[PDB]
RNA sequence: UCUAGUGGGCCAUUUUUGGUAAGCAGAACUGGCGAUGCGGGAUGAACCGAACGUGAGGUUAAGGUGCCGGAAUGUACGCUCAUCAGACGAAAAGGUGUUAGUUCAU
RNA sequence: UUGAGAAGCUCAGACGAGUAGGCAGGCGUGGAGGUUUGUGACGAAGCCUUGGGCGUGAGCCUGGGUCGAACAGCCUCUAGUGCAGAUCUUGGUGGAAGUAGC
RNA sequence: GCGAAACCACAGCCUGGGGAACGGGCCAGGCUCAUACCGAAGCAGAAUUCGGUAAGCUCGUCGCAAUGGUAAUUCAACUUAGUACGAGAGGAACCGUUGAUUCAGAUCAUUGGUAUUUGCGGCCGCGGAGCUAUCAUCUGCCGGAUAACGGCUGAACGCCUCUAAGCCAGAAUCCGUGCCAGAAAGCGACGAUUAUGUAUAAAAAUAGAGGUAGGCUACUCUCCUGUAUCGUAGAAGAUGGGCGAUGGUUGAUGAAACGGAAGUGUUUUAUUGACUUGUCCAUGAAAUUCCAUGAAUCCAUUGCAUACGACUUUAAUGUGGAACGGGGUAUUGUAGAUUAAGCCUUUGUUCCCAAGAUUUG
């Protein structure tokens, strides 16, 4: 059919790292469909979230969300830097993300 | 750009190193990659050059199947000593030929790894399956026999699809709505 | 331990010989059998003129120290279809018999008496109730196959052994087409096969088997090579041990049975060398992988005289019948 | 005015005199380390950057951007085919080995 | 404008590796003088704790449990005052081991 | 049953590099005399030499083979031919035979002994079975790729030119092959059995292909990627009225066909059930009034086995087996006894048992 999907699919690649030092405060996010740093400027400031599930349920809901915001582009290939309210776990490398269309300026 | 939950890649005419690097990067992205026709992988250089390269490796387990040759190249481009690189390997399925489950699925190609778009004209290149035929692999003859059998069935399906497509294509211009509001580029 | 190929020498798990490499077949070749399960009836020295042009024993009488193998007829109650795959040679499906003998049913089990005799019973129902499903299986085999083998088993009750689980092992139906292979298998279904039909007494046989353990020497599956056949004697044949030269009737079994084996009452074959394993041990007799063109196989065999003396102890007479008149009247 | 400690060297640079199978040895000249972590250099104490309170953001150095690995499978020219390249002393030369060719002969 | 523990309050700029060594200010322990019109059988001290808090740190405060008769903060005085090492001393206890073995 | 002590930073796979040891911690990775072959040499041929190449010397039942080791191994003579060569004599390639081996594979028939029939006759005289043997009898590989090496053809160098394209010949080598194992953590067949559209199938060249059409020869068009195509409107999608399709979207079962490879899914539907936003209307969904959303094993039997299990059948009411009673049987031996023990075998006998537990979804 056709769902809602008012967001854009994205992937968690890695932390902002050098060769041997990592900085989990900033995460590198690949917004799929964005292919250059100029294109990444559209998604700057948008709200990105990591939706996952836990077996224990809270308020009758098993879905937990970590909210973040895209800060700046990273590299020439359209990858961006995102800072989350809680630093994303290291195990979520390659995990999917949702990039909202808000806040909007179009 | 856009991705898929599972990807089937046709390894006919793809360079071994170029395809393995792209596949290894995609595996670390969480994608599931299935590479078919692993015995038609091409490597730049003379077939003498790769024969001695493999012969030097023969001199651990020396796998002879072309699929396991490609998996070895992909394995070296992953952090296999850690759990992250261990999970990436389990998300890859390299097979020779096209098995039935992936026979009726779309097979994409990687232009960054295609030999025609990456090798100088007239350069000598060797085929992995052909190269592996004289190192211990003894199923090349049968694998080709199934391949022609699959091609005949695949071609018959294409003709059925093409003949069916002619019906909608003919009826596409029959409906006046197409011509009435074709100003949208459709 | 000089042969590095056998090292590390470890005892073979399966006592029955395993046909690891079947001979190559062709459509022109008639559908036929290569491997035949047998038992070491014994061995006996027999004299035979050596007919070999160019040899220094050419047309010369030479005693042949040879070995005799007990080969009861071969009942087949199953067929397997092997389809070639990129990973390997896989068995598409197995079609056993609608009626299985007690012996082959004993093979599937570890014991016959404790169990409720439930081996392949519900299968025997669906075979009889729905023969069309079996026809589909045979149809599936014929359309998709390159290698066809039969699940033939031995008749232990005919043999003088405490064995009761019928030894079963795949035998390729070499020759013809896959459809022709299935047709022959379907018509010979639940039927016995005699080794005399398989081997023409001049064809080339490389006996394979498992040897005798020693207190890892022994229980080694080893394939003998260049052991020609000289006679496939039948069990009902009382003239098997009496050739044209020695017309005096005699049975291959020495009087008082073979040494540590027993009496032979079924079809037996004749070959030289020593087969892996002692008397009354399962042996497999198969056609040679390579067409041995040496004159040893090419030369016709005209056996001169079979010996049947009491090999146990010291037997001075090959058959009792002649010794009755030769030696004086006994006090009894 | 009086009052603690030091009162070894290593390596490196340059200068050096003779050397002498060749290397090297000998002094001297000068700093660094020795009291000093950090980025790179696969790794490594001497190499390339940089010298240090606790942090947020930004930008760089040296080195890097196929994958492991953060970052262009960037652009524009060329050179290289190895059947041991390259990538980071037998070493001089030879090559029916090339690439660009130049010059001179016709 | 109350912001005079003038030993306080306040404004500004620069700076921050560190062995030997130099200097300053603090934390903790036993006992002594003074003090808190101090704490305690409605539970002192001690010990236990994935309870909480404070301090850059030495350390300190506290909840719960256990426990049963003493104890602490502040100013000063005093010293047998702070340990991971010394093939340290005494005591307890492990792996080797249910081994060697008898 | 009683029972120490030395010792004890912690550990414990390698390979390299890591400059100072660095491996145990660190960094990157795993877990050629002969002969075979030919080439050259007078090398008359024999005799051969040299040159290299060449390291060969759940429970099962039945299968497939990833991966290793490794098919033989060393050499001869006769036949060939007693001849090509050669004045002749001596002695050709290839063929068969006789072989000599090594090692391995066997077996005790032949074979000699050892020999728990330690059996027997008089401590001896020896010994059947079993086993063993350069102590016996014996059996024992393959086709290609090519190396050296010499080519054919063919460029550069209108030819020539082992070579740069190609086609080759040619090795006890290598690879295959065969054999030996079998991925304890490989696999197949068969039997019995307590998320957010999770959307898309040609092949093929690319230095040309496909479609399209005519009768492989002539056509045409498209490619120049998917920024494509399918699909998509409704309280995630309500309630009716319709009109219009009277079609489409599908669910449900009832199905036949196709799909071996890893077919496990493609269709074809038959009927029925609903939906339909195709074109329209009439109501409805909100104050959450700015994001948070039954067999097997053990068991007994069993020897067929031997560090130990394992191994091996039999064995749970009948060739039931296990025992003897034996017979047969040869032994030694002067006929007798043992009489299968790893000699055979029993219309003989009794015993026990349509087991005893355990394991197992």
From Swiss-Prot, chain A:
The keyword Phosphoprotein applies. Gene3D superfamilies: translation elongation factor selb, chain A, domain 4. SUPFAM superfamilies: Translation proteins. It is found in: Cytoplasm. GO terms for biological process: cytoplasmic translation; ribosomal large subunit biogenesis. InterPro entries: Ribosomal_eL33, Ribosomal_eL33_CS, Ribosomal_eL33_sf, Transl_B-barrel_sf. Pfam families: Ribosomal_L35Ae. Transmembrane segments: none annotated. One of its GO terms (molecular function) is structural constituent of ribosome. Keywords: Cytoplasm, Phosphoprotein, Ribonucleoprotein, Ribosomal protein. The modification Phosphoserine is found at residue 96. It comes from the Eukaryota. One of its GO terms (cellular component) is cytosolic large ribosomal subunit. Belongs to the eukaryotic ribosomal protein eL33 family. Component of the large ribosomal subunit (LSU). Mature yeast ribosomes consist of a small (40S) and a large (60S) subunit. The 40S small subunit contains 1 molecule of ribosomal RNA (18S rRNA) and at least 33 different proteins. The large 60S subunit contains 3 rRNA molecules (25S, 5.8S and 5S rRNA) and at least 46 different proteins. Component of the ribosome, a large ribonucleoprotein complex responsible for the synthesis of proteins in the cell. The small ribosomal subunit (SSU) binds messenger RNAs (mRNAs) and translates the encoded message by selecting cognate aminoacyl-transfer RNA (tRNA) molecules. The large subunit (LSU) contains the ribosomal catalytic site termed the peptidyl transferase center (PTC), which catalyzes the formation of peptide bonds, thereby polymerizing the amino acids delivered by tRNAs into a polypeptide chain. There are 2 genes for eL33 in S.pombe. This is Large ribosomal subunit protein eL33B. It comes from Schizosaccharomyces pombe (strain 972 / ATCC 24843).
From Swiss-Prot, chain B:
One of its GO terms (molecular function) is mRNA binding. CDD domains: Ribosomal_L13 (cd00392). GO terms for cellular component: cytosol; cytosolic large ribosomal subunit; preribosome; ribosome. One of its GO terms (biological process) is negative regulation of translation. The keyword Repressor does not apply. It is found in: Cytoplasm. The keyword Phosphoprotein applies. Signal peptide: none annotated. PROSITE patterns: RIBOSOMAL_L13 (PS00783). Pfam families: Ribosomal_L13. It comes from the Eukaryota. InterPro entries: Ribosomal_uL13 (IPR005822), Ribosomal_uL13_CS (IPR023563), Ribosomal_uL13_euk/arc (IPR005755), Ribosomal_uL13_sf (IPR036899). Keywords: Cytoplasm, Phosphoprotein, Ribonucleoprotein, Ribosomal protein. The modification Phosphoserine is found at residue 182. There are 3 genes for uL13 in S.pombe. Component of the ribosome, a large ribonucleoprotein complex responsible for the synthesis of proteins in the cell. The small ribosomal subunit (SSU) binds messenger RNAs (mRNAs) and translates the encoded message by selecting cognate aminoacyl-transfer RNA (tRNA) molecules. The large subunit (LSU) contains the ribosomal catalytic site termed the peptidyl transferase center (PTC), which catalyzes the formation of peptide bonds, thereby polymerizing the amino acids delivered by tRNAs into a polypeptide chain. Component of the large ribosomal subunit (LSU). Mature yeast ribosomes consist of a small (40S) and a large (60S) subunit. The 40S small subunit contains 1 molecule of ribosomal RNA (18S rRNA) and at least 33 different proteins. The large 60S subunit contains 3 rRNA molecules (25S, 5.8S and 5S rRNA) and at least 46 different proteins. HAMAP family: Ribosomal_uL13. Belongs to the universal ribosomal protein uL13 family. This is Large ribosomal subunit protein uL13B. It comes from Schizosaccharomyces pombe (strain 972 / ATCC 24843) (Fission yeast). The gene is rpl1601.
From Swiss-Prot, chain C:
Pfam families: Ribosomal_L3. Residues 1-24 are annotated as: Disordered. Keywords: Cytoplasm, Phosphoprotein, Ribonucleoprotein, Ribosomal protein. GO terms for molecular function: RNA binding; structural constituent of ribosome. One of its GO terms (cellular component) is preribosome. Signal peptide: none annotated. Residues 8-21 have a biased composition (Basic residues). It is found in: Cytoplasm. The keyword Iron does not apply. The keyword Lyase does not apply. Component of the large ribosomal subunit (LSU). Mature yeast ribosomes consist of a small (40S) and a large (60S) subunit. The 40S small subunit contains 1 molecule of ribosomal RNA (18S rRNA) and at least 33 different proteins. The large 60S subunit contains 3 rRNA molecules (25S, 5.8S and 5S rRNA) and at least 46 different proteins. uL3 forms together with ES39L one of the contact sites for the signal recognition particle that targets ribosomes to the endoplasmic reticulum membrane. Belongs to the universal ribosomal protein uL3 family. There are 2 genes for uL3 in S.pombe. This is Large ribosomal subunit protein uL3A. The gene is rpl301.
